[PDB]
Paper text:
Here we present structural convergent evolution on fusion enzymes of aldehyde dehydrogenases (ALDHs) and alcohol dehydrogenases (ADHs). We discover BdhE (bifunctional dehydrogenase E), an enzyme clade that emerged independently from the previously known AdhE family through distinct gene fusion events. AdhE and BdhE show shared enzymatic activities and non-overlapping phylogenetic distribution, suggesting common functions in different species. Intriguingly, despite distinct quaternary structures and < 30% amino acid sequence identity, both enzymes forms resemble dimeric structure units by ALDH-ADH interactions via convergently elongated loop structures.
In addition, a BN-PAGE for BdhE resulted in a single band around the molecular weight of tetramers (391.6 kDa). Therefore, BdhE was suggested to form a complex, but it is not polymer like AdhE but a stable tetramer. The results revealed that BdhE formed a ring-shaped tetramer, while AdhE formed a helical polymer, even though they were purified in the same condition. Looking into the cross-section of the BdhE tetramer’s electron density, we found that the tunnels where substrate passes were connected between ALDH and ADH domains. We found a gap in the tunnel wall formed by a BdhE dimer, which were not found in AdhE dimers. In an AdhE dimer, the linker of ALDH and ADH domains filled the gap, while the linker of BdhE formed the elongated loop (loop 2 in Fig. 4a and b) and thereby remained the gap. In BdhE, however, another BdhE dimer partially filled the gap in the tunnel wall within the tetrameric complex, suggesting that the tetrameric structure is more effective at preventing intermediate aldehydes from leaking out than the dimeric structure. Importantly, the RMSF reductions were significantly larger for BdhE tetramerization than AdhE hexamerization. The ring structure of BdhE is thus suggested to confer more rigid enzymatic activity than AdhE against environmental changes (e.g., salinity, pH, or temperature).
Author numbering:
A (entry chain D): 404 to 886
B (entry chain C): 1 to 484
C (entry chain A): 485 to 564
D (entry chain A): 646 to 725
E (entry chain D): 82 to 162
F (entry chain D): 243 to 323
The structure:
């Protein structure tokens, strides 16, 4: 058969061919190798109206009959109808102008928020609303040791079919694949995540993989999915990451050493439960770091190039709640009302930066975490005020509003003065709540700042900050100031 | 000074005779790097490498899902070189940094999207439930297979983007490509070949050869072992490449220049219309193929539109490409500058009124460089040569009309059919105007809206065939009908 | 019961002096479109919702101002 | 009304405004184009602004007030 | 049908058993292709995901006739071609 | 080449040298009938005629005699008969 195929393909023509055999499999194996436009098995001259025909090689090109034949006699025209008809509506046209603001965005917040004392049993009815009966709890070893996933399992009762606790801090594609395999072998139709931002993002990726199949690396795209994914319920255990209401999930690619993104409105969790029990036992360091991460989210959202009044309101309310309630939590660790207020502030900060997008501070924090395994909250907190001063001149009256939210009096002052006062208030709160303030404490060497700055420019968070980053020479300056 | 080598058979090698040439920065006329000059022997070597990689390599035999993982690795290694690709593009082709900083990200996103579509949604096997023949019962179905060795020729307009387009469309469908970049801008193709080598793409799948003159191109087009030619450039060179390829009956796809018309209706928003017209005419100094160099403006809004257009055009800044404050850079070469000057002189001779520009620009702090001021011509009739011949420069002609039918007649009165644009306050009116335009792409209240799944191509003498989307992917596969 | 806390049910507030019932669930799924010249976005919003035959509901006073005409022109062929 | 889940309809046979209250009757989308309010007269402008202010102030005071609703009400009051 | 078959047999040399089906085949092809064009051919096609997040809007494909076509046929199968 | 000067779309359908492959497990009667038909329909003036007949060595002797007899059984005469 191989010799027959070699002889048949040994020609300059590719019009047609035929194979006669007593086995369909053998005939098709011979036929799939023939370089001809038409192959007949146990027949010849089998003309058809919807069967395209044509030649390979020097037998010509193009087809006749069928949709393939009909497509030869039509042109293809692409028509684009712009959603906006105003100046400055497209970021692409901002290249030929000095103004870089792009305020045209669409706002949405479909997540069902459940909060209050003893609101965990509501998950039993939320499962019925979503039409799911087989939930698998996704968590990690640290959270599983505290017994909160046991509480979630008891609340779910018969709607829980498994628990996966192997999610690691700074999860990767293989972690997502293993979690998805474990969820699939249990026959899950919904995912419940109990943990920090890493757990929630891994659960978003797991939901995408479960819905579409394949591997995690296949789905790393922006706004590609067109339909809702597997239902997801997020139960945060940190006083802020915002991931329970955002549309972005960050996953590390160990074969590349770079954090990759999946960004889609359809990966937003369907619901979230803000039970104060899940943050009542949080230690002091985690509390202050997550509160400062939420504050960084709210402040950056208030300053980015895509800031909108709705996002401004969310950011200001979150800033006010954090400023009022963080000292209460630090002084009175099991104050339940302050914990609930911090949870709500985190949710609203997540809502804010979901649309307004983060700036340079998160671009720096992501590289710090990817290279030196530094936690997200500490990195965001230590660079928030230096970024504030970095953007103090291109930020307008937004920083004055932030300062007023923090409490600094701005009955009259220049925009520079109010912007500096806001950073002074942020530093005052940071020092009041026992927050680390320098990179030298966490072991980053002085010389690696050049490599960190070079790795910083590769993130997508740039070009969303108020001040355009000219290059690594300014990232160097901010990193050195943070040392 | 950096040195670059040809990428043949999965490795970087020098030319057979060891000859090299030097590239030059159009922004300051300083040498950038030395690149190996491929001869006919190197072209033959590339052709045999691609032929072996197709006939006996594992690339065409593996499933689309198996190709998808390799394409994902390729896209990741492409993202890893974003800054280097942007810097090389700015220094070699004159792209401003604000424009050139997105090339690697766009190419990687395109690679991933097309790989996912091929692996998940492309109809590799299609059934024929009703064949139309009752005398031949059996199963009829369609198999789609790679063509073979593909040759992709790209111009100097958008080197990185066009190289990404050619490479993705060729290798994602299972073919093997030999890429020949423009003489002026060869660096970006080699940098992308570096990522191709790093990602572990099988040898012979991607080959890049750079050579001056036209012997290498003729050898590529007339060789019997090449199955398809995908050419982008001017109409005159494409019409000759098609004649050369006619002797062996091989598939040819042509993407030629255009004289795209931008139509402003009387109900359009003047601020948005002016911004869009300025962008679509002066992006990359008017060296984009789909540039709207013909600006059709209604008579009811001509006076208000002209002053705003003049102010917006004079607000543009021309400077060094690597400076982030620059909006416009230099032209690609001195010959292009001389061509633009000649066309401006011709337009002045024909009686058109010079509104702005029409002279060279001296960038402060820089000696040398092919800088030209953006130019606007008014009082232009549609039968003037400047309104009929492509320029490839920052020159625009403004033509006034009285009605939508007259605007459509003026827009269709050309030998090119690449693209077009309509600005109006009503979607229905804009679509009524757009459905009559004989162009491959129409933008309503926008311009240069590129897309990964949006096909683009030319009507008339702007070429034939499409790129991107399923329409673009279908150009690189054969159709086989199997009857059991 | 969805809640296991004191004061979670308005019915039990009859036998107490405190009438606050803070236990509610928040949602805001509406897609907000805003800005200068954002009306043409309805053409794409119709495609997102999977609809092709829209009927404009208005009144005489608004119809006299010509805004429904603008909406109809934005919808183009999606208005019946 | 473009984001609320309640619709009030008069019942002429009873002479009483009846209600339909459901999260599924919330509009899927809304367009905030300033053209649709640029020509609004003075009386309508002030009355609608005061209606929005009344909404925000009452929401900040009701028995079911929540911090998210408080933030919305305060931002609306500030903007008005 | 009969006139076409007789003319084909006398002009191109087709045997009558082969040439007697040409008109029926041509009419069936015409009807089938017309029905497919009117009912199933994608004259308008949507692009739900354009791959560009910086240019929101509706993208779709229109398919239009090319223009004047020239068809040259050989002497093998005149009526069918 | 002529149409290249104006850049117009061209579709080419040229001749062929189509090969007909008979494997060793094929039914000899059906294979012989199909080969004879696909080679001698319309005196071999069809574009897709299988003028190259690839026959396996394991069945060559049995196939050749049947092919010869089937070919000699053909009648050549007036088209209208």
């Amino acid at each position: 058969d191989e010799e027959a195929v070699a002889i048949a393909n040994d020609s300059i023509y590719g019009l047609a061919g035929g194979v006669y055999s007593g086995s369909n499999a053998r005939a098709q194996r011979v036929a799939t190798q023939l370089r001809t436009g038409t192959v007949w098995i146990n027949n010849y001259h089998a003309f058809g109206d919807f069967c395209p025909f044509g030649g390979y090689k020097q037998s010509g090109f193009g087809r006749e009959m069928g949709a393939s034949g009909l497509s030869e006699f039509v042109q293809v025209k692409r028509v684009h109808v712009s959603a906006y008809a105003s100046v400055g509506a497209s970021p692409a046209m901002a290249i030929l102008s000095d103004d870089k603001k792009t305020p045209f965005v669409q706002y949405n917040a479909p997540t069902n928020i459940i909060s209050g004392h003893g609101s965990l049993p509501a998950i039993y009815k939320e499962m019925v609303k979503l039409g799911c009966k087989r939930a698998v709890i996704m968590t990690d070893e640290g959270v599983n040791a505290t017994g909160l996933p046991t509480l979630v399992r008891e609340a779910l009762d018969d709607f829980c079919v498994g628990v996966y606790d192997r999610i690691e801090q700074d999860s990767s594609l293989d972690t997502v694949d293993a979690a998805a395999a474990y969820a699939r072998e249990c026959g899950a139709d919904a995912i419940v995540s109990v943990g920090g931002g890493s757990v929630i993002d891994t659960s978003k990726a797991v939901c995408v993989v479960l819905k579409n199949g394949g591997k995690c690396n296949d789905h790393m795209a922006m706004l590609r999915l067109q339909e809702p994914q597997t239902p997801h319920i997020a139960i945060p255990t940190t006083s802020g990451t915002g991931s329970e209401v955002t549309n972005v999930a960050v996953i590390k690619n160990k074969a590349v050493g770079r954090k990759v993104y999946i960004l889609d409105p359809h990966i937003v969790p369907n619901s979230t439960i803000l039970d104060p029990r899940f943050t009542l036992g949080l230690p002091h360091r985690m509390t202050v770091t997550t509160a400062l991460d939420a504050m960084t989210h709210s402040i950056e959202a208030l300053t980015s190039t895509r800031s909108q009044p709705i996002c401004d309101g969310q950011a200001l309310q979150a800033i006010r709640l954090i400023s009022e309630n963080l000292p209460r939590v630090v002084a009175k660790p099991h104050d339940e009302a302050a914990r609930a207020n911090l949870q709500l502030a985190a949710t609203m900060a997540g809502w804010a930066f979901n649309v307004a997008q983060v700036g340079l501070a998160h671009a720096m924090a992501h590289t710090l975490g990817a290279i030196h395994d530094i936690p997200h909250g500490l990195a965001c907190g230590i660079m928030l005020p230096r970024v504030m001063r970095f953007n103090v001149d291109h930020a307008g009256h937004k920083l004055a509003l932030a300062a007023q939210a923090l409490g600094v009096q701005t009955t009259g002052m220049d925009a520079r003065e109010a912007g500096l006062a806001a950073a002074q208030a942020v530093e005052a709160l940071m020092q009041s709540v026992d927050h680390p303030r320098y990179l030298s404490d966490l072991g980053v060497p002085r010389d690696n700042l050049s490599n960190l700055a070079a790795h910083a420019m590769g993130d997508a968070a740039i070009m969303f900050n108020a001040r355009p980053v000219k290059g690594p020479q300014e990232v160097m300056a901010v990193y050195e100031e943070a040392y | 000074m950096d040195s670059y080598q040809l990428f043949l058979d999965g490795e970087f090698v020098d030319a057979a005779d060891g000859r090299t040439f030097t590239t030059t920065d159009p922004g300051n006329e300083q040498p950038v790097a030395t690149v190996a000059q491929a001869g006919e022997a190197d072209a033959l070597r590339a052709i045999e490498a691609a032929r072996w990689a197709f006939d006996h390599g594992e690339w065409p035999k593996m499933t689309p899902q198996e190709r998808a993982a390799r394409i994902y690795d390729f896209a990741d290694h492409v993202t890893k070189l974003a800054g280097r690709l942007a810097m090389a593009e700015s220094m070699d082709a004159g792209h401003v940094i604000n424009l050139s900083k997105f090339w690697a990200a766009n190419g990687a996103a395109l690679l991933r999207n097309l790989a996912h579509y091929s692996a998940n949604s492309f109809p590799w096997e299609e059934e024929i439930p009703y064949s139309g023949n009752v005398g031949a019962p059996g199963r009829d179905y369609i198999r789609r297979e790679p063509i073979g060795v593909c040759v992709g020729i790209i111009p100097w307009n958008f080197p990185a983007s066009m190289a990404f387009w050619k490479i993705s469309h060729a290798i994602i469908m299972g073919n093997t490509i030999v890429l020949k970049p423009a003489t002026q801008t060869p660096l970006t193709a080699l940098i992308i070949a570096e990522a191709a080598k790093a990602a572990g793409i099988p040898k012979g799948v991607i080959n890049v050869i750079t050579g001056q003159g036209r012997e290498v191109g003729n050898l590529l087009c007339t060789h019997p072992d090449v199955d398809k030619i995908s050419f982008t450039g001017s109409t005159s060179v494409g019409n000759n490449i098609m004649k050369l390829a006619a002797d062996s009956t091989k598939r040819v796809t042509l993407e030629l220049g255009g004289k795209s018309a931008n139509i402003i209706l009387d109900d359009a928003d003047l601020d948005a219309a002016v911004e869009g017209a300025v962008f679509g005419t002066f992006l990359h100094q008017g060296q984009v193929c789909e540039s709207g160099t013909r600006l059709l403006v209604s008579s009811k809004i001509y006076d208000a539109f002209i002053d705003k257009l003049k102010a917006r055009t004079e607000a543009l800044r021309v400077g060094y490409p690597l400076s982030p404050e620059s909006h416009l850079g230099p032209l690609v070469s001195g010959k292009q500058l001389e061509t633009v000057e000649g066309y401006v002189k011709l337009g002045l001779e024909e009686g058109a009124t010079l509104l702005t520009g029409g002279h060279r620009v001296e960038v402060p702090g820089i000696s040398g460089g092919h800088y030209y001021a953006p130019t606007i011509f008014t009082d232009v009739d549609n039968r003037m040569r400047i309104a009929q011949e492509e320029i490839f420069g920052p020159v625009v002609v403004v033509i006034r009309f009285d009605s939508d039918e007259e605007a459509v007649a003026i827009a269709n009165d050309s030998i090119y059919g690449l693209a077009g644009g309509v600005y109006s306050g009503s979607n229905a009116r804009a679509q009524r105007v757009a459905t009559q335009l004989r162009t491959g792409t129409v933008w309503i209240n926008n311009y240069h809206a590129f897309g990964d799944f949006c096909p683009f191509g030319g009507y008339k003498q702007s070429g034939f065939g499409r790129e991107m989307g399923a329409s673009g992917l279908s150009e690189f596969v054969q159709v086989k009908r199997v009857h059991v």
